[PDB]
Design an enzyme around this catalytic site. Sequence first.
Site, PDB file in Angstrom:
ATOM      1  N   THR A  66       0.826  -1.203   0.000  1.00 30.51           N
ATOM      2  CA  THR A  66       0.000   0.000   0.000  1.00 30.51           C
ATOM      3  C   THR A  66       0.866   1.261   0.000  1.00 30.51           C
ATOM      4  O   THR A  66       1.767   1.391   0.830  1.00 30.51           O
ATOM      5  CB  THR A  66      -0.941   0.037   1.221  1.00 30.51           C
ATOM      6  OG1 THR A  66      -1.783  -1.124   1.207  1.00 30.51           O
ATOM      7  CG2 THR A  66      -1.840   1.295   1.219  1.00 30.51           C
ATOM      8  N   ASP A  77      -2.843   3.692  -4.317  1.00 29.74           N
ATOM      9  CA  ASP A  77      -2.710   2.585  -5.278  1.00 29.74           C
ATOM     10  C   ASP A  77      -3.904   1.600  -5.153  1.00 29.74           C
ATOM     11  O   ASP A  77      -4.803   1.809  -4.323  1.00 29.74           O
ATOM     12  CB  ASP A  77      -1.329   1.905  -5.151  1.00 29.74           C
ATOM     13  CG  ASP A  77      -1.270   0.866  -4.049  1.00 29.74           C
ATOM     14  OD1 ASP A  77      -1.619   1.202  -2.896  1.00 29.74           O
ATOM     15  OD2 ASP A  77      -0.879  -0.286  -4.337  1.00 29.74           O
ATOM     16  N   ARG A 137      -3.372  -2.205  -5.354  1.00 28.34           N
ATOM     17  CA  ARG A 137      -2.946  -3.568  -4.973  1.00 28.34           C
ATOM     18  C   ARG A 137      -3.296  -3.863  -3.511  1.00 28.34           C
ATOM     19  O   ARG A 137      -3.055  -3.024  -2.646  1.00 28.34           O
ATOM     20  CB  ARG A 137      -1.437  -3.757  -5.189  1.00 28.34           C
ATOM     21  CG  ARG A 137      -0.948  -5.195  -5.036  1.00 28.34           C
ATOM     22  CD  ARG A 137       0.533  -5.364  -5.356  1.00 28.34           C
ATOM     23  NE  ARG A 137       0.803  -5.623  -6.776  1.00 28.34           N
ATOM     24  CZ  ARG A 137       2.017  -5.802  -7.318  1.00 28.34           C
ATOM     25  NH1 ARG A 137       3.136  -5.751  -6.578  1.00 28.34           N
ATOM     26  NH2 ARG A 137       2.117  -6.031  -8.631  1.00 28.34           N
ATOM     27  N   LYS A 186      -9.087   2.206  -2.166  1.00 25.88           N
ATOM     28  CA  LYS A 186      -8.566   2.562  -0.833  1.00 25.88           C
ATOM     29  C   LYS A 186      -8.950   3.976  -0.369  1.00 25.88           C
ATOM     30  O   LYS A 186      -8.779   4.283   0.813  1.00 25.88           O
ATOM     31  CB  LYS A 186      -7.046   2.407  -0.801  1.00 25.88           C
ATOM     32  CG  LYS A 186      -6.593   0.976  -1.009  1.00 25.88           C
ATOM     33  CD  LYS A 186      -5.086   0.856  -1.011  1.00 25.88           C
ATOM     34  CE  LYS A 186      -4.676  -0.533  -1.466  1.00 25.88           C
ATOM     35  NZ  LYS A 186      -3.204  -0.699  -1.411  1.00 25.88           N
ATOM     36  N   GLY A 214      -2.440   0.063   6.451  1.00 25.60           N
ATOM     37  CA  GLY A 214      -2.242  -0.822   7.603  1.00 25.60           C
ATOM     38  C   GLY A 214      -3.095  -2.078   7.475  1.00 25.60           C
ATOM     39  O   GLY A 214      -3.132  -2.690   6.404  1.00 25.60           O
ATOM     40  N   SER A 235       3.222   0.873   3.168  1.00 22.51           N
ATOM     41  CA  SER A 235       4.531   0.229   2.933  1.00 22.51           C
ATOM     42  C   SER A 235       5.453   0.981   1.961  1.00 22.51           C
ATOM     43  O   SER A 235       6.674   0.969   2.149  1.00 22.51           O
ATOM     44  CB  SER A 235       4.349  -1.225   2.472  1.00 22.51           C
ATOM     45  OG  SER A 235       3.408  -1.318   1.418  1.00 22.51           O
ATOM     46  N   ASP A 269       7.847  -0.046  -4.213  1.00 25.35           N
ATOM     47  CA  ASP A 269       7.410  -0.909  -3.098  1.00 25.35           C
ATOM     48  C   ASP A 269       6.715  -2.179  -3.606  1.00 25.35           C
ATOM     49  O   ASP A 269       5.745  -2.086  -4.352  1.00 25.35           O
ATOM     50  CB  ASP A 269       6.453  -0.144  -2.177  1.00 25.35           C
ATOM     51  CG  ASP A 269       6.054  -0.942  -0.941  1.00 25.35           C
ATOM     52  OD1 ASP A 269       6.950  -1.353  -0.171  1.00 25.35           O
ATOM     53  OD2 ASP A 269       4.839  -1.156  -0.749  1.00 25.35           O
ATOM     54  N   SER A 287       2.993  -2.371  -2.814  1.00 21.54           N
ATOM     55  CA  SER A 287       2.195  -1.493  -3.682  1.00 21.54           C
ATOM     56  C   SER A 287       2.206  -1.939  -5.140  1.00 21.54           C
ATOM     57  O   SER A 287       3.175  -2.539  -5.608  1.00 21.54           O
ATOM     58  CB  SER A 287       2.722  -0.066  -3.603  1.00 21.54           C
ATOM     59  OG  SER A 287       2.822   0.335  -2.255  1.00 21.54           O
TER      60      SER A 287
HETATM   61 NA    NA Z   1       5.230  -2.481  -6.491  1.00 22.54          NA
END
Ligand code: NA
Lengths: 234, 232, 218, 242, 236, 241, 246, 229
Positions: free
Chosen positions: C1, C17, C19, C33, C47, C129, C166, C169
């Site tokens: 995230t 994002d 994912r 989100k 989280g 993240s 990330d 993400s």
């Molecule tokens: Na990624």
Amino acid sequence: SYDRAITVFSPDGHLFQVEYAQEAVKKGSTAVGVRGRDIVVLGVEKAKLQDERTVRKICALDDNVCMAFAGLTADARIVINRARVECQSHRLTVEDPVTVEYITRYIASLKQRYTQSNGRRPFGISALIVGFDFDGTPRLYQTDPSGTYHAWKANAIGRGAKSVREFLEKNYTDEAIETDDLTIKLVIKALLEVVQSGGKNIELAVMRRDQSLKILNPEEIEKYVAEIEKEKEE
Amino acid sequence: DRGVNTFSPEGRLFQVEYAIEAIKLGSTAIGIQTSEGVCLAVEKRITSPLMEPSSIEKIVEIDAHIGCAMSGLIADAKTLIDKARVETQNHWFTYNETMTVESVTQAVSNLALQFGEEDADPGAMSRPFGVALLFGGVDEKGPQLFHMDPSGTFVQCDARAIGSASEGAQSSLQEVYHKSMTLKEAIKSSLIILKQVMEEKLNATNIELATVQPGQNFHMFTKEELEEVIKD
Amino acid sequence: TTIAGLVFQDGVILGADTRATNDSVVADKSCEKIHFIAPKIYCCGAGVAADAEMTTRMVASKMELHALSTGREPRVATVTRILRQTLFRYQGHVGASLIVGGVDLTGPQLYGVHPHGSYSRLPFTALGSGQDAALAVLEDRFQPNMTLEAAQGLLVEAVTAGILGDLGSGGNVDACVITKTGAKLLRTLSSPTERSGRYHFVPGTTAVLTQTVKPLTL
Amino acid sequence: GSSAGFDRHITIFSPEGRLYQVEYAFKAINQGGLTSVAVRGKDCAVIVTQKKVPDKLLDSSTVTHLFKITENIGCVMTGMTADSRSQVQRARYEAANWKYKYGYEIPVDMLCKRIADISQVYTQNAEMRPLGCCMILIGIDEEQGPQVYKCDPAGYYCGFKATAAGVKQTESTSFLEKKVKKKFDWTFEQTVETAITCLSTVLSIDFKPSEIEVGVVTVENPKFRILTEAEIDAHLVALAER
Amino acid sequence: NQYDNDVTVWSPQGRIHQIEYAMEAVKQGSATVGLKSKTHAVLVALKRAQSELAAHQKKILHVDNHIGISIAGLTADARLLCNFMRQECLDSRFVFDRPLPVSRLVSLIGSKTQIPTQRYGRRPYGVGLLIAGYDDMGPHIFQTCPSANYFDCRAMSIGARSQSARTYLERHMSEFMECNLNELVKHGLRALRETLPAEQDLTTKNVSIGIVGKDLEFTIYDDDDVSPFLEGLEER
Amino acid sequence: GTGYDLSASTFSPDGRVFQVEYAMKAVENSSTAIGIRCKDGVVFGVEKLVLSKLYEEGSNKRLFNVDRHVGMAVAGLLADARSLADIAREEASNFRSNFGYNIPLKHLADRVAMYVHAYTLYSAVRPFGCSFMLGSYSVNDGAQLYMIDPSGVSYGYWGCAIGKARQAAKTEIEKLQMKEMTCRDIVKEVAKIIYIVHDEVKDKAFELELSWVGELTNGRHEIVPKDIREEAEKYAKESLK
Amino acid sequence: SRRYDSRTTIFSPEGRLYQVEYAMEAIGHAGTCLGILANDGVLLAAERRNIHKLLDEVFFSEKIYKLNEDMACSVAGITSDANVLTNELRLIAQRYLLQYQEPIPCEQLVTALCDIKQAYTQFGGKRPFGVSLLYIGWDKHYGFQLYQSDPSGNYGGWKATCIGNNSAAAVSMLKQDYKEGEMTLKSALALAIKVLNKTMDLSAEKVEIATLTRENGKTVIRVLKQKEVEQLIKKHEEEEAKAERE
Amino acid sequence: GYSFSLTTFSPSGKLVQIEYALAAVAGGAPSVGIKAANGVVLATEKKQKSILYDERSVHKVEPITKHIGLVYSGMGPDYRVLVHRARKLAQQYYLVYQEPIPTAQLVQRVASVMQEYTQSGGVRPFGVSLLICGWNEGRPYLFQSDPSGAYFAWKATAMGKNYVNGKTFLEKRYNEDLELEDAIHTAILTLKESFEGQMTEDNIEVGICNEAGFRRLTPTEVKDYLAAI
Ligand code: NA
Ligand code: NA
């Protein structure tokens, strides 16, 4: 919750609410109980459009102990359920089954606590609890709304229970006890005092030494109606 | 209409007043304290011969050294008898000893005005116990007889009665009682004083007698033992 | 995230994002989100996904109750206070890291709210993240009072830096512009990545033992 | 006025549908022997009542029916003084608790609604009486401008252009409805002097500084200003020509 | 008639009749007297027998080594309120290792007995106490009532025909502080039999004495225990 | 009125809570207690009617210490008055616990007044049959004196009286210029007023209880010592003649 | 407090409960609700007291409530009290089902609510629920069943019975015409409309019928539509008129 | 508190406090609700005693959530308890189910609350009948709920002063597929039967419910409907 004092003493030392609960017993259907050697018996007074099974006033509490009642039928059902709970709960606590004295003492104790605890009116019933003990002695006790209890040889409660007990006081001899048939005949004679035209309007059940409860159907009841009325002539 | 914890203008609780009035309806009982033992006698008041006589326990064993006789509301008494029985064995558990007759009577006397409406637990009492108790036993201070009433007032008694003919029997106890008498004289005194006030004419099935001595435990009298005493 | 937020001249923009990862496996490719709170208040979820879901649900209901009673458009300070005092009582076990953005009576407002119940009022922030990639993009090229066009471009570039950088993400950039006159929910504003297949099995290749057919009269 | 059961003793319905115990709480407001008046200007809002000091042995500062609920909000009570203080304590609690829970200054309508909703609980539950008192709140709303808000023992509440409560309520509301119909440039001077002259002409007394007390909030100074006896004296002598 | 049944109901006279009815529980209860010297505090109680066969009623109770009480009213409220005093004394000996001041104990009785006079469905304690005790401030006699009021005393009497006792005590006040123990007990006994008629007087059966001071802990004297004190003056 | 006067949860048709009014009558029947605000503090004086000479001096003490810096003077049903002192003691103790300094008297008066008001709303309880006066002195706040009644109203007073001679005591206080006078002077004049308003014909003999708080005591509520009380009792008797 | 107490949970001097009796008088004014057992089914037929031109008709019923998959009931009394009791019946049915994973037997569900109704007569100081219920159902032990209950917490099993306005008049009419062991649901539907013709003051908007039956190992509860009711009304009018001539 | 019912059965067998609460409703300021084919209308009398009363401040016609609205006759303070509670009950449904609460189900839940005060300890029932408009499955809903806790789904009805006249007026003059234009006009005509004075945008209040949820109509929106009467 409701903490009002329901049952209290009067000017002349009467618990009026317990006395009015005993008036509710005297309107209910005439229940009668009789003891013997080998057998113990209960019987009750009585519409064409009803299931007889649902309005049954003879109820098993454990395998060895059953009871009859007279008074308010809703009030009866709670005492019966809580008796049934205590019967199994007794076995859970001490293994050995319930003596007829212990369950009567409990029902008495429950009835007495409702005559003295806050928020609660008394149970408007008297009961006739019967069965066989651990050692195998036959028993018949009687409780009432006050929560007093006493053993009996035979007893009545309900409509005209004076005239039934007056009849039972005379008729309860050793001759009527000895056989299983003769004890059952005595109960029907007693109910025929109050029941305006008997047969079909009599519920009746029995308990033997080691065996469980057994309700007699109207076909079995009308057999003993013939065995009574023939013997009267001779 | 008024509350259970209401004083009269005379300065006493109406429900306690009316609980004393309830004992008059109850059947009469006598207890006599002697140096050789405490006897206790009571009428059963049997309303029918169908009713089993042995299942009217109006004198009962509290312990091996104490008994209690009752008059008034029989159901109300059984709550107090069980609490006494619990108290004695709770005392035996904690202290490894017998209670005094005073100590048992006091424990039951603490329950007398434990009633009321507002500020109360789930199983707490609405009214008093309409029961007079005649305790009678033998502890370290000799044989003792103790009276209790619905107020909670308890006191030692040389001789006392309670019930319908409490008034009548107490006059007969005044004349008959002597402080240096024997136990067997005190036993027969009670059955004389009971036979008068009943007028069912007294017999082994119609009454309960029981005694407690220093040597012997609480003993309730049988048909054969009552039939021997019956009348002389 | 990777979730992020940005205050500009006429309003606020919130980025996120798409994912959703289960351990190190991609469970969802396309999910929102950016959650609704009020008409001109939205919130980004990071989280623990359930805690992010249910707190934003709960505060939305509280703001509907609060707005209906007051007869007023709700304040962004009020959502932050409600979240904080919910999250503080649970001592961080309700693990909802949230970026709360909106406009009210007192202007455009952006708050970072962490799961223990701490908060921070800010002009830009990032969480999840891939917060560091997005927050690095914001620090590099943020200025006070951005245009509507420049803020979208910067906030897309921030969330994209997380998406690529990330492993948690991924996927598309959802966004939400909250101007004074309402809120424009630009879902699928960007798509960094862009399949083949076709494994046609013949009917009868799967072997069958039992067959029962329930026709649906009811 | 039909009656049955305990309908005049506890808050339960009469046959007509009234609550007599609620109606008796309105009669209890008059027992104080005072009348309050409240007025809303273009850029302000003002409250006024009798600062009745019969005994010289009273500390006249401690004798007051005007109370500060928050910085931006203040009220005039009228009725039973014990009930009046108690209702003020609860208004202060709920106002503060609002700023704790929600993070902003409680608006004047919602504070008045909150206290009115509390009053309803007494209106429905038999175990307690209603409070024999009447809270008139004033304060500056940011969006909506200045506000005047009364609430009853019944649990009613409403916003007002001007209002009154107490002994001479009907006379005060009759005076205010005459003056509101006429056009005025409702300045701080206009709003204050209407409140004093309404209370004056209804009761038929030329007031001195010690015989009244004045609370006010302006657009420039929205904090709850209770005017001193010197500041009251200036507005009284401004009406020397009338 | 309307304001008689509940303790919460104020009368239009400005009185609470359930308190004043509870006061009558003390008055119809038996007579008891209490008094103090410079060194000691004494309680004397006329023990009422039920019938002449039955033993006499216990009227003087033990609370602590330094405090004891005599009662008049309902015995259950006496025993309840006795156990409260016994416990608060026990708390003070546990917590502080020091006997509880008598005035402080008496304040806790007043605080406790007041609570139910203000609450619905509750009643005042139908019992009055005379409380003898010694502490750092010397000997004390305190009185308590159903109304929750309490009084520090040179001496006092309460119960049936106790006006007679109060009249005797009010004459001999300055004598009490100078008296030795035997003279102080004899004074309390003469106050008690003034309550009785001329026909009947004090015996070892119907009298109990309770004594505490500087030398002695709260000892109770009932039967042959009493015989030393009575044999001194006995006429009229 | 009759029917509507049994519960504090019941108004009458006139708009009056008679249970509260009947609690105020128990104060009006109780003996006279007074207190005056000086320049340098506050003084309390009380007509304590001796029911019997059998009782000790300093029994039925109608003057109490609520805090070290605050004094309470009561009139009414005394059991209720002592429980109100216990409420005020704890309430003052709670302030010191919460905020680390001595409670202000206006606040202490308000917080105990709302305690008194709570008992005037319900059938479940009755009002306190007691009015009392709280008095205090400080460095910054100075001399302050407040009175509370059964209803729960709290007002501040330069001079104040409650009991039998409520109105009669107040007209005697109006003569004194308390604002200029000091605590040393006022003890004589407080003792004078009790002896005037005392009915020797109707009531029995009495003991004058005197307490004070001021610059003399360093803002601490102490009893007036036997030197000064007996000087003021002598002044009361000789200036009555 | 003690003055304001109605005291709903006490015996009157006669030896009986006033609020229980007074609640049964409320039922005697409410709409005529009846039930009839048969060999191949069970039915409930009720008087529809919600009758106006401007009523909407949202729900499939008005007085009839489904309880379990194999059970249903109708009511007579205060409809608000019925909504509480029916909600609680449904809760009991699922509480049994969660526990044992079988449907609750009909007598057990009725005793469970009747134990609660009896509590309001014995303790709590609360007024009883002013509702009599007629229950219908099937279970594996006794099959097709009809039960009655009332505010006391007392119940009984019936072959046919009635509650509401003209209760006694309807039961005596049912005592004539009901044949035990011999009645089918078609013959029972005729008798239901016969009895409601006597009691009420007969359009199909004023009547509301439902039939519990067992078809292919699963219970089938369905309200009748107004086409089905109106044809059964005309069959009564023709059968009534055909006997009148001969 | 008091743990016993204040509402109890009389010898006739009637819950007397509920019928006494209905008298409080029956003597309330009147209220009307009408169900069109495409929507729902709720209208009521907002005639306060003076011109001093700020008309914009407090509202009779109130929203519960974005798709349901509410109006009353009888007791105003009692009404506000039910509004706050209904608003909570809507969110408690939306939180659990993530769907806008059905109007039938909101009425059933508020009915259960209204029933609660006809039995539970130490409380009178509410002196209020509610009218509850809504939009669920692409179609309108109108329900009454009265002090008993009983509820009835209405096509149209009236409450308060001259409810008997309003109901008969509506019965003949209501058609079962009216347009929402016409129904709003009918609702104002139902109020004008029972009115005492000249009607204005201020002294009455109207709300509506349709495809895009519930809202309260503005004074100017009402003024357009008042122009052609
Ligand atoms: Na990624
Ligand atoms: Na109330």
